[PDB]
Amino acid sequence: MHVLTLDLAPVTPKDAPLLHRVFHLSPSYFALIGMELPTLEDVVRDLQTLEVDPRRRAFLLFLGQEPVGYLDAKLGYPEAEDATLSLLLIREDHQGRGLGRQALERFAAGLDGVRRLYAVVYGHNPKAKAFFQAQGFRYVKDGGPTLTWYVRPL
Numbered sequence: 001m002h003v004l005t006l007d008l009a010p011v012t013p014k015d016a017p018l019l020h021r022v023f024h025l026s027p028s029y030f031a032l033i034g035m036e037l038p039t040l041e042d043v044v045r046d047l048q049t050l051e052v053d054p055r056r057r058a059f060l061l062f063l064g065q066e067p068v069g070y071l072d073a074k075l076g077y078p079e080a081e082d083a084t085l086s087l088l089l090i091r092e093d094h095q096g097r098g099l100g101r102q103a104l105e106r107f108a109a110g111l112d113g114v115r116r117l118y119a120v121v122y123g124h125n126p127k128a129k130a131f132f133q134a135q136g137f138r139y140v141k142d143g144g145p146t147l148t149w150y151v152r153p154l
């Protein structure tokens with residue numbers, strides 16, 4: 001059986017163990033960007049940091065009770081009127097079923113009053129670049145060797 005509708009649950013520091021597990025079930029992403037899997041202590045610290053920023057919009061992605069991804073954006077960056085998506089991750093066993101597109105469309109639906117939505121891609125990740133272009137994000141610039149910027153009007 002399949003749950004179809006993806007729920008976007010706002011993340012809090014008590015979610016650290018669940019977000020840790022999502023990252024640990026996504027090893028290929030961390031290898032691609034040249035990083036060890038995050039420690040639980042690292043995930044806690046990162047959640048404490050986003051907790052105190054009123055403009056961060058971060059979510060665990062749920063199918064029923066199962067955490068199957070993570071979405072992290074910042075309103076008001078690069079400009080006050082815009083938003084930027086810094087991470088969209090679907091757990092590796094749930095990739096290729098349209099959940100990335102669903103998460104993006106559900107998130108963008110909530111941004112009436114925002115002007116443009118940027119996405120920043122880290123490292124040599126052409127698969128992610130192909131995904132964002134397919135969803136209507138055009139290339140803006142590269143941000144040095146490690147970063148590439150894309151944008152979609154709302």
Ligand SMILES: [Cl-]
Nearest residue numbers: 002003004005
């Ligand atoms: Cl459903």
